[PDB]
Design a protein around this ligand. Structure first.
Ligand SMILES: [Zn+2]
Ligand SMILES: [Zn+2]
Ligand SMILES: [Zn+2]
Lengths: 497, 86, 546
């Protein structure tokens, strides 16, 4: 029927131009458009949904062309499209199941596919109209922030976390640029961007320290894109890490050149010296450094004392890794392990059995971490004697090997990832309160007397870029500044200098 | 027996002019503030955390917050103070 | 007048909050005097170098609204100072000024572009420093992308400096130069395009190094993607050279030239007609290229598979040749060890089938081979591989309604296995049920009579899954199964008594729930209506209550 109406409309123009007067063109066109389109709008609206369900782009294009001739006739189609896109996004996310909660790639790719399909549909069929792209943007913003995955996590901050975890998987060890651009497209619709930024910084730190980046060009591309996406403070905060790594490379080279003057180190030694303030890492637990490693510790401490007298070092033993070679096995094989595993593996060389409670005193490792790393050791099948018993004796399993020449026994701990996520989520919440307090202080500094609603509006418009503050937390911040004597009440507040 | 071939270590550097203590108040950096200790436990005591700066100088958050009401200069350090970590 | 002066005074308050709020207030005022304009412009430039970061961010964002209101002459010296700041020795100033220039170009008349390009052209040529090259290339690409047609007089000047950069040791310079070249070709004169194409051909003819030929092949692909129709007249010389390059041993070089063929096949259809046979032959010959394993080079296989899809999806008038020569190869290559290549070959064959909507008899002749391959492919552990087979069957049945008449005994157990497998996910189950529904709808009822005993239990189990999406498809399949077990329009000797209670009991629970979603209710009503209509006589006391 749309084809028939489109043909009839052109026939009418031909007729009126050929053998009528030119003053009838407006009236004939209006009457024909009325009788052919405006009287069947309910049928057109019903057919729109069915054409959306079974993808038929040409039919949708013809419907858009026909209904665009009626004044205020495109309004219902926009609402229908918005509802359809929102439902499609929610359904697509829901079919993934519980796996999307721990698989960033699937979760991000589903959203990317849903966005791409309807973006192409809008660009092709609807002639890239502003009203339709507005509906697409609203629908995407709705279903990205709230969906089934966020309900399971009981928070709307899980989506930025999953996006940041997908970026890290992409950038770890031609087409990558396109998917990075798609990720930046998705990042536009996120309400809580500080959650994304903190996680991205925390994973870039791990990538830089452990030297497990794919290529530096991809890192530069991400920095450049985040420059246009985010502001300038975040970019400088990230650049400080690169500057520290660059400085540490030169310092390590200078130490390596200078080491040959004295007796050479029996083992290969590389160091990464980082500024405490810039990097997110925390202080290490108490530890008894192994005797085999004391010389390198003392030599570097003395050297760095001479290079810079003012500064003092603070070693991190939960991020240091090395290589080990064994001759007690059936065949000599080299293995890679962390410093803690080295300490609780170099503890015995000829001794076969040790008690966990007895071995604890020598290494001085805390019991909580010690047990958890013993599960990692036992699962490696390289050690043998599922809850722990302090009186258990552990004995080496001789005559055990693996198919590969080398084995990597540096496996992430079972609970460490969950604890890291929880701690980061708590730090984000604390930082939000600190930023709100700072914003209130600045507003009171600029304006001596202000009202409650005006203050709330100013805080909301100042912090809207990063996150959307809740009203109760702003009032709580006002109360906490009341106790701190920054401002005092006179519904109206005044700065007390 | 086992032997070690390669070891990669990570370390962090900070100013040693401090004794691992705040400069504004002579308490150990992990402990609470003088105002926090003298006063009773409240919501203010819950928000006591060490704060760093671009100059890599570490003080209590409350101490530097009190100090910055009148001045805008780091205590041990004549450059302007900016926040970078909590 | 007086109001702006107070802000200008507070921007030097030596306090962070006062500077921040003064800049914010000025930005707000601009969004909503000759002497005052100069002071504001100088202060924003001075704040670009402030110690604090938030003040710097506000100063950068202020440059946008500032240029629109202030007179044109001031914009000239703003551009001058920013371009000078790019070449400054200080590292942070270059970064902070680059964003400023990008914002100024974004919020933008013809004179400022000419002022910018003069510095940019000299900045790109600096071979000693690479960071300036990278940022200058980015800025020039942004400038050409938006409002780039105005600089008609500077196109040869821009091209004279870009072509040397394609031999740079840094691979990022080449990648950022290709984008600028494409944006230049997007809107330019006819004389410059001829020079660019001639230079690329001359460089390719005298291949200096392996890394150089890759770069020019990528440049040809990119220019074909953007320019499109304009390069069609020059394909007669492009194709033979690339075909000769395709035989080089380098694995990487093959992928780029296959992608180059794909761009010519897709972007410009008219001029590529003679060489379609050569492109198809090359893609077929390299589709089976595994020089290591017999029954690091999966990229070339993927490229060949994608180029075949590009060829098939466009040329409608080549179906007799398609089913003659490309169809047997794709079916034979359903056994790819890598999943990524297998997905590509499945997508290509699906594109062929969608195009097929005489071809029909040739497809019906090839159906047995497709069934033979899919029978082996439906036993795989991976969910993704199994998921493509059902989309294969659905499209095949849709194109040919009675295609699978002779292969129901071998196709039913494959569906049954995926229906009740524990490792299967929701998407696989939904696709299997959808395929079963389409198979049942488009075949004679007498075929499925032996297999009803096998089909009923898994479907009944699927009606009771906690996830409602599976339940909806299960009810839809149950409706057609009810129509199949006892048709009312034709005579049947089949006995349907044992399954009546099995279907009724599972349907009635969903009918009377009062807590399920809309779709499940709307499908339960429809399924129960069909049950009553076809097999209501055998139901006992349940019908009056229902
Ligand atoms: Zn203190
Ligand atoms: Zn305190
Ligand atoms: Zn300081």
């Amino acid at each position: 029927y749309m084809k028939k109406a489109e043909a009839r409309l052109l026939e009418e123009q031909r007729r009126v131009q050929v053998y009528l007067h030119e003053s009838t063109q407006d009236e004939l066109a209006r009457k024909c458009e009325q009788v052919l389109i405006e009287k069947h709008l309910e049928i057109f609206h019903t057919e729109f949904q069915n054409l959306l369900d079974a993808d038929k782009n040409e039919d949708l294009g013809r419907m858009y062309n026909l209904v665009s001739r009626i004044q205020d006739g495109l309004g219902e189609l926009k609402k229908l499209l918005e509802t359809h896109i929102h439902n499609q996004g929610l359904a697509a996310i829901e079919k993934c199941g519980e796996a999307a909660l721990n698989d960033p790639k699937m979760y991000v790719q589903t959203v990317l596919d849903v966005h791409k399909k309807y973006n192409a549909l809008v660009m092709s069929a609807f002639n890239n109209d502003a009203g339709f792209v507005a509906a697409l943007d609203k629908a995407c913003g709705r279903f990205i922030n709230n969906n089934a995955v966020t309900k399971m996590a009981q928070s709307s901050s899980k989506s930025p976390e999953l996006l940041a975890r997908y970026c890290d998987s992409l950038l770890k060890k031609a087409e990558l640029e396109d998917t990075l651009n798609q990720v930046m497209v998705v990042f536009k619709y996120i309400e809580d961007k500080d959650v994304f930024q903190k996680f991205y910084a925390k994973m870039l730190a791990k990538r830089l320290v452990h030297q497990n980046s794919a290529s530096d060009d991809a890192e530069a591309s991400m920095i450049s894109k985040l420059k246009q996406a985010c502001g300038f403070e975040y970019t400088s905060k990230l650049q400080r890490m690169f500057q520290d790594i660059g400085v540490s490379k030169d310092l390590n080279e200078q130490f390596k050149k200078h080491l040959t003057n004295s007796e050479p180190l029996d083992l290969d030694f590389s160091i990464q010296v980082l500024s405490s303030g810039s990097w997110p890492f925390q202080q290490s637990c108490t530890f008894a450094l192994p005797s085999e490693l004391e010389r390198s510790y003392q030599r570097f401490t003395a050297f760095y004392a001479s290079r810079h007298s003012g500064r003092k070092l603070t070693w991190l033993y939960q991020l240091s890794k090395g290589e080990l070679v064994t001759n007690c096995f059936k065949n000599r094989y080299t293995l890679q392990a962390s410093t803690f595993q080295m300490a609780i593996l170099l503890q015995y060389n000829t001794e076969d059995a040790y008690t966990v409670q007895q071995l604890t005193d020598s290494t001085q490792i805390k019991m909580d971490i010690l047990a958890q790393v013993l599960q990692i050791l036992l699962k490696s099948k390289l050690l043998v004697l599922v809850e722990l018993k302090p009186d258990t004796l552990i004995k080496l399993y001789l005559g055990y090997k693996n198919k590969k020449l080398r084995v990597n026994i540096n496996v992430p701990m079972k609970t460490e990832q969950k604890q890291e996520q929880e701690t980061t989520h708590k730090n984000i919440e604390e930082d939000r309160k600190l930023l709100i307090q700072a914003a209130i202080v600045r507003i009171m500094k600029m304006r001596k007397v202000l009202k409650h609603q005006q203050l709330l509006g100013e805080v909301l418009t100042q912090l809207s870029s990063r996150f959307k503050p809740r009203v109760p937390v702003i009032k709580k911040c006002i109360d906490i500044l009341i106790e701190k004597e920054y401002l005092e009440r006179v519904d109206t507040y005044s700065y007390l200098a | 027996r086992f032997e070690v071939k390669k070891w990669n270590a990570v370390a962090l550097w900070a100013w040693d002019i401090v004794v691992d203590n705040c400069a504004i108040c002579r308490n150990h950096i992990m402990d609470l503030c003088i105002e926090c200790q003298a006063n009773q436990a409240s919501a203010t005591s819950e928000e006591c955390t060490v704060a760093w700066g671009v100059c890599n100088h570490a003080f209590h958050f409350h101490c530097i917050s009190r100090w910055l009401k009148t001045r805008q200069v780091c205590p041990l350090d004549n450059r302007e103070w900016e926040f970078q970590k909590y | 007048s007086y109001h702006i002066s107070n802000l200008l005074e507070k921007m030097t308050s030596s306090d962070k909050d006062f500077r921040f709020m003064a800049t914010n207030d000025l930005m707000t005022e601009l969004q909503k005097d000759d002497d005052s304009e100069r002071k504001v412009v100088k202060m924003i430039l001075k704040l670009l170098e402030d110690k604090n970061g938030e003040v710097q961010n506000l100063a950068v964002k202020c440059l946008g609204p500032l240029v629109s209101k202030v007179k044109e002459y001031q914009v000239e010296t703003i551009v001058d100072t920013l371009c000078t700041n790019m070449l400054s020795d200080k590292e942070q100033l270059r970064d902070i000024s680059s964003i400023g220039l990008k914002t100024v170009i974004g919020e933008l008349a013809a004179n400022v572009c000419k002022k910018i390009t003069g510095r940019l052209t000299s900045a790109i040529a600096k071979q000693e420093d690479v960071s300036v090259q990278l940022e200058a290339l980015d800025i020039m690409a942004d400038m050409l992308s938006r409002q780039g047609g105005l600089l008609v007089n500077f196109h040869p000047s821009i091209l004279t400096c870009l072509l040397p950069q394609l031999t740079s040791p840094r691979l990022a310079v080449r990648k950022r130069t290709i984008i600028a070249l494409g944006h230049l070709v997007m809107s330019c004169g006819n004389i410059v395009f001829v020079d660019l194409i001639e230079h690329l051909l001359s460089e390719l003819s005298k291949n200096d190094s392996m890394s150089t030929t890759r770069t020019y092949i990528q440049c040809i692909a990119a220019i074909s993607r953007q320019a499109g129709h304009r390069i069609g007249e020059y394909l007669e010389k492009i194709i033979p050279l690339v075909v000769k390059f395709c035989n080089v041993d380098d694995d990487e070089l093959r992928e780029y030239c296959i992608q180059a063929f794909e761009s010519f096949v897709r972007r410009c259809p008219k001029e590529v007609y003679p060489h379609v046979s050569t492109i198809i032959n090359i893609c077929l010959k390299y589709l089976t290229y595994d020089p290591n394993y017999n029954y690091m080079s999966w990229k070339v296989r993927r490229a060949a598979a994608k180029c075949l899809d590009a060829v098939v999806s466009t040329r409608h008038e080549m179906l007799p040749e398609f089913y003659k020569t490309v169809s047997p190869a794709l079916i034979s290559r359903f056994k790819e060890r890598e999943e990524n290549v297998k997905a590509d070959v499945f997508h290509a064959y699906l594109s062929l089938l969608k195009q097929t909507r005489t071809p029909l008899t040739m497809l019906q002749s090839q159906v047995p081979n497709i069934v033979k391959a899919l029978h082996k492919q439906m036993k795989e552990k991976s969910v993704k591989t199994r998921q493509c087979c059902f989309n294969m069957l659905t499209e095949l049945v849709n194109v040919l309604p009675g295609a699978l008449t002779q292969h129901i005994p071998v196709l039913v157990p494959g569906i049954i296995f995926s229906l009740n497998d524990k490792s299967s996910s929701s998407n696989l189950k939904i696709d299997a049920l959808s395929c079963l529904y389409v198979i049942l709808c488009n075949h004679s009822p007498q075929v499925f009579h032996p297999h009803v005993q096998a089909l009923v239990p898994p479907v009944v189990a699927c009606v009771g899954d906690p996830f409602y999406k599976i339940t909806s498809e299960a009810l839809l399949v149950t409706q057609q199964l009810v129509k199949v077990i006892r048709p009312l329009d034709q005579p049947s000797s089949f006995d349907a008594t044992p399954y009546i209670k099995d279907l009724f009991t599972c349907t009635i629970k969903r009918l009377k729930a009062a807590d399920i979603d809309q779709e499940v209710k709307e499908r339960a009503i429809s399924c129960m209506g069909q049950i009553i209509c076809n097999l209501g006589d055998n139901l006992g006391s349940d019908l009056p209550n229902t």
